[PDB]
Ligand binder design. Structure first.
Ligand SMILES: N#C[C@@H](O[C@@H]1O[C@H](CO)[C@@H](O)[C@H](O)[C@H]1O)c1ccc(O)cc1
Ligand SMILES: N#C[C@@H](O[C@@H]1O[C@H](CO)[C@@H](O)[C@H](O)[C@H]1O)c1ccc(O)cc1
Lengths: 487, 487
């Protein structure tokens, strides 16, 4: 693998003194303790326990990184690395086992996050809390289909309210949703992720949904929940320095050729990924291209919530992993959309017209290394969407572990270190070109449960040893980050 | 009126030695002799004779500029002005009174154009012939609704064939259609122009058409006719130096603000005007934006004709008069397209967001003076569509004559001269920036019948005196052009 020359390797003062460096996790992927201390089941419990064959290694998050119990080790590692901040998520059904206020607040759940938050702040690490990361209380699915019904909105905002009340005095940085596009397209469109729904004829666990309509329904409910939650926060919790936003996953998209049809395809593709959630919070409606394509499958916001939607963010999280080429597909009698993503009339190609991959594989099936893509997205944010305050809230890659990765080999994560150095170098170029980015969070602090891939992909800068009690060991990437942070 | 400074006034050698300067007319607008020498009625005869109240001054083209009889004066004026070329059109029903080959070729019709062509070439003026300028044989409308039926295609190509056979040995520059967008949207959409059709509830002479579907039907038939005609020409007539194309009218479109929604509106607007005809001849299909918006109202080309369509031009004519701002309209349950142009989801505003007109009025109801718009269109042609060889095949403006314009005042057309100088100055900037433009034709050589405006708008560089036998007198603009051409 070809590394950056020594003088091209980023140094901490490439970035402003106030810039944040951190790492990120999510509740289901690290916590474990899935049935402990009163916690209710989430969709991810239900999915792993009923459809184990839909996880590639038949694994689950019953234990994960055992962070419910081992959270003090999590904080120790962040401190030793010199991190300024930490993104973690709250487990909805750990706080409200039945999903609702009326089912009761689980105080053991609450105390857990309270201890975590206290420990981080005692060590000078600023918490950035994500309220929801795909782990809907299964009881809400039992009651009404969860995000498939507008009833979700009140339960979500009740949940957010509990979070703001219990933690808001100490936590000033909030994100309502994380990767809403992945959540909608992949949990309800291709059905890869819990609850695993898709159209008849699509291969997924529960092929009785509708890959053309459900992703939009769920997206719409989540956006209404977001607008309302931001309104609650602004009215009752923001005060002098509180901030709330959301974190979007954005694939970079490069026109397959520099020809108008493929440029137009790239634009529809960006609209269908970034614009789907960003344009609603920025201007109060979905991108024109999405409506004109999918028509009555895209719902309309009501007047009052629409006013709440517009500008409903203090900052936007960008989670960036990779890019593809976007190639035009003609509208013809021969093309009939199957998945919501087909509404973009574009194919996403990993190989360009000269036969070359966009960039090299980093290990897993989809993350190709293309740091220039981040620059393209940030210039779009800066020039098209008003340059809001941004955080790279996730950036990382997975090492494959199919049972023959010796720990010593796992610790020498040179590919990951190169990946991180190169994205930081591009990020420096973006900030110098005026993009308002204020921090960077590696995905992930810990090797963890990588959804349908189970434990076969390790994304951590810290190794979690499943054969040794989930003991943590800094990888070389974490050691580099420690030197970089001057710690 | 504020004129260019003397050193900013264009001189002939601003332009290449091989560059062409000319003027243009069309058959119905200048010829008169509407029922003479065997000529059949066109739709424009029929419209003026049945719906005189739909011409603002209740006038018609029975005589027009009397150019069927006075054509030798037309040629004299072109020669004295030093013009290199002349664009005129052939009257379909003057060549085939019944519209069809089977109804017979009108030899008196043929001899007329033959004399005109001989006289031009004797005087060193290159003819650029337009085959069709909106004057469909009324007999074809009687037989099958003319352009509303695919039967038009064979009759048109038969007509084109007669033209190529009779004139092609001496004429090497052909244009199949002129302003196909105006022809479709305005004759079948707003119904202002013959045959005056529109949807019930739209104000026009024959409000029993459909302003949402007929413009597309007619456009589609004209494009199929074009592809087939170019194929005939290339196979049997082109030889070593023959050239065939078409001339498109293009409004400049400026985004109402430099904001993504209005930029997107500007792009849809350009697609709906320029791209509607240019993208078919360039790539073999309509712009994506037009299909995704109007769906089943836009027909599909067949495989074989589509192959003929792609690249079916040696040069593209640009007829440019004016620009507007294009402002975004949202797709909502409240918006329902009435006219085909509503499919662009954009309003065309003559006033921008600061309250200023895009440019000043030149006289009539729609031509605002905005020469920078031509530059924008030419850069689009150069950068987006491959920079094909281009001619400004029309450019001009009208002086209002409602019966109180003394001839001496009409001759001092300073507004027109300023308009021409300023567009030539912008054209110089475009050519210097690499646009492949090879000539410029003023609309019009002669004051003429300006369609629904009748004789109330004079567009000529040469005055045609209706009170003095249609005698011709060069206006100041023509005198400037004469000095410019060094003649
Ligand atoms: N985009 C994306 C992926 O998810 C986000 O990135 C992490 C690495 O994949 C993941 O662990 C994290 O939870 C997410 O924020 C993604 C993951 C899985 C599937 O099927 C699609 C996308
Ligand atoms: N665009 C346009 C107008 O037509 C073209 O320009 C000339 C001046 O208007 C006209 O005389 C010529 O025949 C055309 O090539 C146009 C004219 C009338 C109406 O109603 C709409 C557009």
């Amino acid at each position: 693998i070809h590394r950056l020359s020594p003088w091209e390797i980023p140094r901490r003062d490439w970035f402003p003194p106030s810039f944040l460096f951190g790492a990120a996790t999510s509740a289901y992927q690290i916590e474990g303790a899935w049935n402990e201390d009163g916690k209710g089941p989430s969709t991810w419990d239900h999915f792993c326990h009923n459809f184990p064959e839909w996880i590639v290694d038949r694994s689950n998050g019953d234990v994960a990184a055992d962070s419910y119990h081992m959270y003090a080790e999590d904080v120790r590692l962040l401190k030793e690395m010199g991190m300024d901040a930490y993104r973690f998520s709250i487990s909805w059904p750990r706080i409200l086992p039945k999903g609702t206020l009326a089912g009761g607040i689980n105080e053991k759940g609450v105390e857990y996050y309270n201890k975590l938050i206290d420990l981080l702040l005692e060590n000078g690490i600023e918490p950035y809390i994500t309220i929801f990361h795909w782990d809907t209380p299964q009881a809400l699915v039992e009651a009404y289909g969860g995000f498939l019904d507008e009833r979700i909105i009140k339960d979500y905002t009740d949940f957010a309210k509990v979070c703001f009340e219990k933690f808001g005095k100490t936590v000033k940085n909030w994100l309502t949703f994380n990767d809403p596009e992945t959540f909608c397209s992949v949990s309800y469109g291709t059905g890869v992720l819990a609850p695993g729904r898709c159209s008849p004829g699509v291969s997924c666990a529960v092929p009785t949904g509708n890959s053309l309509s459900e992703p939009y329904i769920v997206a719409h409910n989540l956006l209404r929940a977001h607008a309302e939650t931001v309104d609650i926060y602004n009215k009752y919790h923001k005060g002098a320095d509180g901030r709330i936003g959301l974190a979007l996953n954005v694939f970079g998209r490069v026109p397959y050729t520099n020809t108008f049809l493929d440029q137009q395809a790239q634009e529809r593709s960006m609209d269908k990924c970034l614009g789907w959630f960003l344009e609603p919070v920025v201007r109060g409606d979905y991108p024109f291209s999405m409506r004109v394509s999918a028509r009555d499958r895209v719902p309309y916001f009501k007047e009052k919530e629409q006013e709440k939607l517009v500008g409903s963010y203090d900052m936007i999280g960008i989670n960036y992993y990779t890019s593809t080429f976007s190639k035009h597909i003609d509208l013809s009698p021969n093309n009939s959309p199957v998945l919501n993503t087909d509404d973009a009339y574009a194919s996403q190609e990993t190989k360009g017209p000269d036969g070359n991959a966009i960039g090299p594989p980093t290990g897993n099936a989809w993350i190709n290394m293309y740091p220039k893509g981040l620059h393209d997205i940030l210039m779009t944010m800066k020039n098209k969407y008003g340059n809001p305050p941004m955080y790279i809230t996730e950036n990382g890659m997975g090492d494959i572990d199919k049972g023959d990765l010796p720990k010593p080999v796992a610790l020498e994560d040179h590919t990951r270190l190169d990946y991180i150095q190169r994205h930081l170098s591009v990020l420096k170029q973006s900030i110098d070109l005026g993009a308002d980015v204020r921090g960077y969070f590696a995905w992930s602090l810990l090797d963890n449960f990588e959804w349908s891939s189970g434990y076969t992909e390790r994304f951590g800068i810290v190794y979690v040893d499943r054969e040794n009690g989930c003991e943590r060991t800094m990888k070389r990437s974490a050691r580099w980050l420690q030197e970089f942070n001057g710690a």
